[PDB]
Amino acid sequence: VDPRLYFENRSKFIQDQKDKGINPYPHKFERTISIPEFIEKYKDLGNGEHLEDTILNITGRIMRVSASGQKLRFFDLVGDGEKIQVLANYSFHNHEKGNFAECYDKIRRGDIVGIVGFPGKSKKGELSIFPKETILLSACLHMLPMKYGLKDTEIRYRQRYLDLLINESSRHTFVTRTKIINFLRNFLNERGFFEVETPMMNLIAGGANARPFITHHNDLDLDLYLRIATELPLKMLIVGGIDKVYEIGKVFRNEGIDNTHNPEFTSCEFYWAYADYNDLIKWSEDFFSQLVYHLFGTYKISYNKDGPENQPIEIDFTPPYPKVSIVEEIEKVTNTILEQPFDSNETIEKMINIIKEHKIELPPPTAAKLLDQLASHFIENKYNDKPFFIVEHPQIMSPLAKYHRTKPGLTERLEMFICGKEVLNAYTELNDPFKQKECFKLQQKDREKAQLDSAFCTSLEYGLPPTGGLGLGIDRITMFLTNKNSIKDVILFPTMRPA
Amino acid sequence: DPRLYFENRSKFIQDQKDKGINPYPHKFERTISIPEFIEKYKDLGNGEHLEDTILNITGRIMRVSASGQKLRFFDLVGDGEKIQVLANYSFHNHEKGNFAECYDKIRRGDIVGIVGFPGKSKKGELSIFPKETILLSACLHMLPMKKDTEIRYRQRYLDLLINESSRHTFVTRTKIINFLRNFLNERGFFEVETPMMNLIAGGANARPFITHHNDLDLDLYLRIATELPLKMLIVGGIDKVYEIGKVFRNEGIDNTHNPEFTSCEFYWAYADYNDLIKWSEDFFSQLVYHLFGTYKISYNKDGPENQPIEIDFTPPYPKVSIVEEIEKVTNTILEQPFDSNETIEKMINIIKEHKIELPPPTAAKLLDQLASHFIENKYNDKPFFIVEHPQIMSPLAKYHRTKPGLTERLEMFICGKEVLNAYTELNDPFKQKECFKLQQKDREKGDTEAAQLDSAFCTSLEYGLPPTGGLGLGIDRITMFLTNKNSIKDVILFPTMRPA
Numbered sequence: 001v002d003p004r005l006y007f008e009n010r011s012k013f014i015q016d017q018k019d020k021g022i023n024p025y026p027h028k029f030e031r032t033i034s035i036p037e038f039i040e041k042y043k044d045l046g047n048g049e050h051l052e053d054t055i056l057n058i059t060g061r062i063m064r065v066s067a068s069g070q071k072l073r074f075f076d077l078v079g080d081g082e083k084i085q086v087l088a089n090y091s092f093h094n095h096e097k098g099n100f101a102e103c104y105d106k107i108r109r110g111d112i113v114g115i116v117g118f119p120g121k122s123k124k125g126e127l128s129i130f131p132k133e134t135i136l137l138s139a140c141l142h143m144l145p146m147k148y149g150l151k152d153t154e155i156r157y158r159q160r161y162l163d164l165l166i167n168e169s170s171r172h173t174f175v176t177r178t179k180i181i182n183f184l185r186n187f188l189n190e191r192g193f194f195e196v197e198t199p200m201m202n203l204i205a206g207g208a209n210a211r212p213f214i215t216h217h218n219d220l221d222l223d224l225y226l227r228i229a230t231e232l233p234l235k236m237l238i239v240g241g242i243d244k245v246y247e248i249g250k251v252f253r254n255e256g257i258d259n260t261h262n263p264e265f266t267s268c269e270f271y272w273a274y275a276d277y278n279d280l281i282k283w284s285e286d287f288f289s290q291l292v293y294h295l296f297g298t299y300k301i302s303y304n305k306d307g308p309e310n311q312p313i314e315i316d317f318t319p320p321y322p323k324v325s326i327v328e329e330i331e332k333v334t335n336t337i338l339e340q341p342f343d344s345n346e347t348i349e350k351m352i353n354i355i356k357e358h359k360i361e362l363p364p365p366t367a368a369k370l371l372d373q374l375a376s377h378f379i380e381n382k383y384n385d386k387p388f389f390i391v392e393h394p395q396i397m398s399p400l401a402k403y404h405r406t407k408p409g410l411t412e413r414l415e416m417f418i419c420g421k422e423v424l425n426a427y428t429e430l431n432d433p434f435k436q437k438e439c440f441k442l443q444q445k446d447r448e449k450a451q452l453d454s455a456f457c458t459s460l461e462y463g464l465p466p467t468g469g470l471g472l473g474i475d476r477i478t479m480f481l482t483n484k485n486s487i488k489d490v491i492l493f494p495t496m497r498p499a
Numbered sequence: 500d501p502r503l504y505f506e507n508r509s510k511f512i513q514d515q516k517d518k519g520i521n522p523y524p525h526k527f528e529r530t531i532s533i534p535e536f537i538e539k540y541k542d543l544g545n546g547e548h549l550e551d552t553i554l555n556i557t558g559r560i561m562r563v564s565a566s567g568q569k570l571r572f573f574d575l576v577g578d579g580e581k582i583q584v585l586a587n588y589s590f591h592n593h594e595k596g597n598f599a600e601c602y603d604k605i606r607r608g609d610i611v612g613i614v615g616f617p618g619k620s621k622k623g624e625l626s627i628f629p630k631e632t633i634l635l636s637a638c639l640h641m642l643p644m645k646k647d648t649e650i651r652y653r654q655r656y657l658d659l660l661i662n663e664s665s666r667h668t669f670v671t672r673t674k675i676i677n678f679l680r681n682f683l684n685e686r687g688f689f690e691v692e693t694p695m696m697n698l699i700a701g702g703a704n705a706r707p708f709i710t711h712h713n714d715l716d717l718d719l720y721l722r723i724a725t726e727l728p729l730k731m732l733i734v735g736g737i738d739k740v741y742e743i744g745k746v747f748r749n750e751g752i753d754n755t756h757n758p759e760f761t762s763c764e765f766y767w768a769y770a771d772y773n774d775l776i777k778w779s780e781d782f783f784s785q786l787v788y789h790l791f792g793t794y795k796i797s798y799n800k801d802g803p804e805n806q807p808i809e810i811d812f813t814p815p816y817p818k819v820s821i822v823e824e825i826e827k828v829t830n831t832i833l834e835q836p837f838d839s840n841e842t843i844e845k846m847i848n849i850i851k852e853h854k855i856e857l858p859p860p861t862a863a864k865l866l867d868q869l870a871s872h873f874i875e876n877k878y879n880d881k882p883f884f885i886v887e888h889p890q891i892m893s894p895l896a897k898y899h900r901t902k903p904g905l906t907e908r909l910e911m912f913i914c915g916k917e918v919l920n921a922y923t924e925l926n927d928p929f930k931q932k933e934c935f936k937l938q939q940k941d942r943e944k945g946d947t948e949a950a951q952l953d954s955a956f957c958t959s960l961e962y963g964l965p966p967t968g969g970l971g972l973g974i975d976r977i978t979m980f981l982t983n984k985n986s987i988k989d990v991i992l993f994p995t996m997r998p999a
C-alpha cells in the first residue's frame with residue numbers, strides 16, 4: 001500500500017486517542033508472568049482445556065492479526081523470542097471495560113499490548129491467552145517489513161531492531177555472541193586471571209601495526225589516539241605484579257572496512273607470566289575445543305564459507321591443530337630460499353619478483369608487508385576443515401615478540417586461522433628492553449620510508465618477567481560459531497556508509 | 500645517583516651477554532606459586548626443612564641482606580604475598596658457579612627463578628632454601644621505597660609493586676563489576692555492546708570527543724552514554740538489556756571526573772520509576788554486604804587528615820524532590836515554565852545573592868547548580884535519592900504521571916557525588932521530538948553540552964517502545980566510596996594525564 005499514509009493515519013490515531021482522553025502510552029502495566037514462563041506453565045495443558053479461574057496479566061508485541069468474524073479475534077503475541085496465540089472471544093470479554101469490537105478493531109500488527117486474561121488451549125491444541133481486556137501500551141506507527149524485505153538489504157544493519165523482531169535467527173546469533181564472551185570470561189577467571197580496564201585514549205597508539213583514530217581533549221589541550229590494541233598497558237601491569245591479567249573490550253583501527261573488518265571491534269588479550277609460546281599453543285587448543293563443545297555438544301560444525309547458496313564446509317575443532325612455519329612453508333610452496341636478513345635488498349627483490357610472477361598485488365613494499373602478502377596468498381588457506389597455526393614469524397614481522405630460542409631471525413609467535421581468517425595472535429613476550437628499543441628504532445626507519453612509547457620502554461627497564469601473551473578477535477570467532485559471512489552480522493550496529 | 504645505578508645495571512646486562520649467559524631466559528617452569536607456597540607450608544615446625552622436596556619457584560626480589568660469607572637473605576614477593584629466601588652455602592649447587600658471585604649479582608627488584616626446598620627459619624619465617632638461583636629479568640632502576648605523588652598515576656606498576664593498598668583497591672574494583680554483572684545476569688538481563696563511535700553523541704548532556712575515519716572521510720563522535728542504542732534494543736524485543744563499558748565526555752577533569760570512565764546502563768521493559776528505586780536499594784545494600792559483611796562502611800570524605808564518617812547502606816534510602824526542596828531551602832517560588840525568563844532571572848538572583856558561581860545560564864544548568872549547593876549534601880551518613888526532576892532537565896525521561904512539568908526520574912548521591920541516574924523512559928515519539936526540538940533552542944545559546952537529536956532513535960520509537968525503566972551507574976565513583984578513595988584517579992589504573 002502506501003507506508004507514508006499508513007504512518008500519518010496512525011499518528012492521527014494517537015492524537016485522536018489523546019483528544020478522547022485515552023492515554024495511548026500508559027506509564028505502568030504490572031505483568032504477572034512472561035511469555036516464556038507462560039509457555040512453560042501451560043504447555044502440558046489439555047487440547048481444548050481452559051483455566052478460566054486463573055487470571056493473568058501478560059504483555060507482548062502483536063505480530064499477527066486475523067479474525068474469524070466480529071466476535072472471534074486471533075493474534076500472535078511475541079516476547080523474549082517466543083510466541084503464543086491470543087484468542088479474543090466476545091463471550092469472555094469484560095464489557096464493563098468497553099465495547100469488544102471497538103477495542104480489537106484498533107489493534108495493528110506491531111502494537112505492544114497488556115492483556116488481562118486466562119490460560120487455555122484452543123480446540124486444535126493451540127496454547128492461548130484468552131483476554132478479558134486488552135490495553136494498548138505502545139503503538140507501532142509504521143508497517144513492519146516482511147522477512148523477504150530484510151533478506152538481502154542492509155535494513156538489518158541500519159534498523160537492527162526490525163531484524164531482531166522479524167528474524168528469529170538474529171536473536172540467536174547475538175545470544176551466542178554473549179555466550180561466547182561469558183565462556184571466555186569464566187574460562188580465564190577460573191584459571192586465576194584478573195580482569196582490568198586499560199585506557200582507550202592514549203598519548204601513543206601501540207601494540208600492533210595499524211593506523212589509529214585521533215581525537216582531542218579540549219580542557220587538557222591534548223591530542224589523544226584511540227587504542228589499536230591493549231598489549232602495552234597490559235604488559236606494564238605484568239611488571240606491576242598482576243601475573244595473570246586480561247581485558248575484554250573495544251579496540252579501534254582506522255583502516256578499510258569489509259566483511260572481516262569493522263573499525264571498532266572486540267578483542268580479548270591476556271598476559272600470563274612465566275608462560276611461553278608452547279603454553280599459548282596448548283591454551284589455544286584447549287580453549288577453542290572446549291568453547292565449541294560448550295556451544296554445540298560436538299567438536300565439528302558446519303560453516304557456509306561460500307555463502308548460503310553454496311554448500312557448507314565442516315570445521316573440526318578436535319585438537320591438536322597443525323602448526324606451519326611461515327618462512328619454511330613459503331619457501332616450500334614457492335620453491336625459493338629466503339636468505340636472512342629478510343629486509344636485505346636481496347631478499348626483498350626476491351620476494352617482490354615472486355610476488356610479480358604469481359600475479360599478486362605489491363603492497364609500501366616492506367619486507368614485513370611482503371612476507372604478509374606471501375603468507376596471505378600461499379599459506380593462510382592451507383587448511384579449511386580445521387583451525388591451524390602459522391608459527392615462528394620473523395623478527396621483522398614481530399617487533400614485540402621474543403626471539404626464537406633456537407632459530408635465528410625468527411620469533412616464538414603463533415597465529416590461528418579459521419577458514420583463512422586470523423582470529424588469534426600470541427607469542428613469547430619480548431622483555432629485554434635493549435632488544436625492544438632496537439625493534440622500535442627499526443620500525444621508525446621503516447616509518448620514514450607504530451610509534452614507540454617511552455612509558456612502555458621504561459616499564460620494561462624495571463623488569464618484565466618471562467611472559468606469554470595472547471589476543472583473540474571476538475567478532476571473527478562469533479562469525480564462524482554463528483555461521484555468518486560478514487562481521488556486520490555479529491555486531492548489533494556495525495559501521496555503515498551514512499545514508 | 501639513580502642515573503649512575505641504571506648505567507651500571509645496563510652495562511652489567513651487556514657484559515653478561517658478552518660472557519655467554521642469557522640474562523633474559525625464555526622459559527622457567529614454576530612448580531608452585533608464592534600464594535600456594537605459603538598456603539601449603541604454613542603448617543611447618545620452627546626450624547624444620549623439607550630437604551627431600553625440591554620446588555621451582557619464581558618471584559621478584561624486594562630486599563637483599565647478608566650475614567657472613569655463607570648466608571644471604573631475600574624477600575621474594577608474588578601475587579601480593581611474600582616469602583623469605585635463605586641462600587646457604589651448605590646447600591648451594593657449586594657446579595653452577597661461585598656462591599658469592601652468584602648472589603652478589605642480585606639486586607632489589609630482580610625477577611628470579613629458584614630451585615630449592617621448603618623450610619622455616621630458626622625464628623619462624625617461612626622460606627625457600629635455594630640450591631640454584633637464576634636471574635630471569637633484572638630491574639635496571641632503583642625501586643623506590645613506600646611513592647606518594649603523581650608517580651602512582653604515570654607509573655602504576657610501581658604503585659602496584661610497593662603499595663599493598665593499591666592492589667586491594669583494584670581487586671575490589673573488579674569484584675564490584677563481577678557482582679554487578681552476576682546481579683543483572685541472574686535477573687535475566689542480556690549483556691550487549693553498542694557503538695562507541697557514532698554520527699551523533701546522544702543520551703546525556705555532555706560535550707563529546709570527535710574523531711575521523713579516513714577511508715570513509717567521515718567525522719565520528721565518541722559516545723557520551725549508551726542510552727539510545729540500548730532503548731533501540733528494547734524496541735527490538737530484548738526486554739532486559741544492559742552494557743558495562745567505557746563512555747567518553749570532553750569535559751573538565753577533577754577528583755570525580757576522568758575524560759573516559761566506566762558506566763553500566765540497563766533497560767528493563769514494563770518496569771518504571773518505582774521498580775528502579777527498588778533495584779537501587781537492593782543492588783547497593785547487597786553489594787556492600789557482599790564486600791564487607793555489613794551495610795555500614797567507613798569513608799574519609801574530608802581526606803585521611805580528617806576524621807572519617809559512617810555511611811549506612813541499609814535500605815530504604817531517603818527520597819528528596821528537587822524543585823520542592825530547593826523552594827523550601829531557598830524560600831522562593833520557582834514558577835513553571837522553569838525555562839521562562841522570569842524563573843531564570845530569579846534562579847540567577849538566588850545564585851548571585853548567595854555568592855555562588857553562575858554557570859551559560861540555562862534553566863536546566865541553573866536548577867542543577869541550585870541542587871548541588873542546597874540539596875546534594877543534605878545526607879552524608881547514607882545514600883539518598885533526588886527525584887522528580889523537571890522536564891527541562893531530562894529530555895529523555897517520561898513525564899510525571901501526576902505532577903505537571905516533572906518527570907519520573909531519580910539520581911542517587913553518596914557524599915554529594917552522583918553515582919546513579921534512572922527514570923521511567925519517555926516512549927511517546929511525538930513528545931520526544933518536542934523535547935529534542937527544545938534542547939536545540941538551548942544549544943543555540945552556546946550550550947555545547949546539549950543533547951543532539953538522533954533521527955534514527957526517533958524512528959525506532961515510532962515502531963513502539965514499550966513502557967520501560969532504565970538506569971545508569973557510575974562504576975568508578977562507586978569504587979571510590981567502597982575503597983575509601985577521594986579521587987577517581989585512585990581507582991583507574993591509568994588515568995588521563997599530560998605527557999611527561
Ligand SMILES: C[C@H]1CCC[C@H](Cc2cc3cc(O)cc(O)c3c(=O)o2)C1
Nearest residue numbers: 253261262265267423424425471472473
Ligand atoms: C586483536 C587481534 C587478535 C587476533 C587477530 C585479530 C585481527 C583483526 C584485525 C582487525 C582489524 C580491523 O581493522 C577490523 C577488525 O574487525 C579486525 C578483526 O576483527 O580482527 C584481532
Ligand SMILES: C[C@H]1CCC[C@H](Cc2cc3cc(O)cc(O)c3c(=O)o2)C1
Nearest residue numbers: 748750756757760762918919920971973
Ligand atoms: C553514566 C552516568 C550515570 C550515573 C551518574 C554518573 C555521572 C558521571 C559523569 C561523569 C562525567 C565525566 O566527564 C567524567 C566522569 O568520570 C563522570 C562520572 O564518573 O560519573 C555516570
Ligand SMILES: N[C@@H](CCCC[NH3+])C(=O)O
Nearest residue numbers: 208229231425426469471
Ligand atoms: N596486540 C596483539 C595481540 C596480542 C599479541 C600477543 N602479545 C594484536 O593486536 O594482534
Ligand SMILES: N[C@@H](CCCC[NH3+])C(=O)O
Nearest residue numbers: 703724726920921969971
Ligand atoms: N544516560 C544516562 C544514564 C541512564 C539514565 C536512565 N535512562 C546518563 O548518562 O546519566
